[PDB]
């Protein structure tokens, strides 16, 4: 009944974030996972949650669940779960709840996932070992990609959106 969903951005190269934050601002992409999640219950790991900019924290408009696996971890203004399936119950009926990271939380999340929605951004990002990576997406997924488009920041980003 509900469709459970994946939401990132990622250079072409696969990096998701860096140094525990993310490395590029691209505005557009923040006003697509905006216009994404408004409403929706958003699932995120610990690290992603406090990573949050404290002035958006918790999402306004949105049910925040962070997973841990400790379950006396406090995050104020959002529910604590130890795991994706007590996440996903969290989204009550909720008929679209998101995953939003981070990297390790994607993972738990895929086989869970009947879509994705993903900027990609052309920022000359080269993978280092430390770097938070984006989920691969396998065959059973189908997809549309946008045209890319030039940002007001200067980099190039275009959108796929993936079901299964
Ligand atoms: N570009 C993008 O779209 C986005 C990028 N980011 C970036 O990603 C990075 C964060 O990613 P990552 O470091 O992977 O962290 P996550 O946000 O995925 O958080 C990982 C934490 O989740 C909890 N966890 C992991 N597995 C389990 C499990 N099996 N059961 C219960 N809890 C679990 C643990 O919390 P605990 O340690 O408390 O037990 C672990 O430390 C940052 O750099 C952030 O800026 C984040 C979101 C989107
Ligand atoms: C509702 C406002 O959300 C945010 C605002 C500002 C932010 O950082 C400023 C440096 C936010 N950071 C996290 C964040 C930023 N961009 C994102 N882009 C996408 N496409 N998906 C995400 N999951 C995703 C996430 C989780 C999220």
Same mark, same amino acid.
Request: net charge neutral; hydrophobic share 40%; with cysteine.
């Given at each position: 009944?509900?469709?459970?969903?994946?939401?990132?951005?990622?250079?072409?190269?696969?990096?998701?974030?860096?140094?525990?934050?993310?490395?590029?601002?691209?505005?557009?992409?923040?006003?697509?996972?905006?216009?994404?999640?408004?409403?929706?219950?958003?699932?995120?790991?610990?690290?992603?949650?406090?990573?949050?900019?404290?002035?958006?924290?918790?999402?306004?408009?949105?049910?925040?669940?962070?997973?841990?696996?400790?379950?006396?971890?406090?995050?104020?203004?959002?529910?604590?779960?130890?795991?994706?399936?007590? #996440? @996903? /119950?969290? =989204?009550?009926? +909720?008929?679209?709840?998101?995953?939003? *990271?981070?990297?390790?939380?994607?993972?738990?999340? %895929?086989?869970?996932?009947?879509?994705?929605?993903?900027?990609?951004?052309?920022?000359?990002?080269?993978?280092?070992?430390?770097? #938070? @990576? /984006?989920? =691969?997406?396998? +065959?059973?997924?189908?997809?549309?990609? *946008?045209?890319?488009?030039?940002?007001?920041?200067? %980099?190039?980003?275009?959108?796929?959106?993936?079901?299964?």
């Amino acid at each position: 009944r509900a469709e459970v969903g994946l939401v990132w951005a990622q250079s072409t190269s696969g990096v998701i974030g860096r140094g525990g934050d993310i490395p590029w601002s691209v505005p557009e992409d923040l006003t697509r996972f905006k216009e994404v999640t408004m409403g929706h219950t958003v699932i995120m790991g610990r690290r992603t949650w406090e990573s949050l900019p404290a002035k958006v924290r918790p999402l306004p408009g949105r049910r925040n669940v962070v997973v841990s696996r400790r379950p006396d971890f406090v995050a104020e203004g959002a529910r604590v779960a130890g795991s994706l399936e007590a #996440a @996903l /119950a969290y =989204a009550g009926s +909720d008929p679209a709840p998101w995953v939003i *990271g981070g990297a390790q939380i994607y993972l738990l999340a %895929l086989p869970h996932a009947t879509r994705c929605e993903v900027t990609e951004i052309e920022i000359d990002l080269r993978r280092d070992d430390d770097d #938070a @990576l /984006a989920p =691969a997406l396998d +065959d059973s997924w189908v997809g549309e990609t *946008g045209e890319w488009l030039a940002s007001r920041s200067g %980099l190039r980003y275009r959108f796929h959106s993936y079901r299964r």
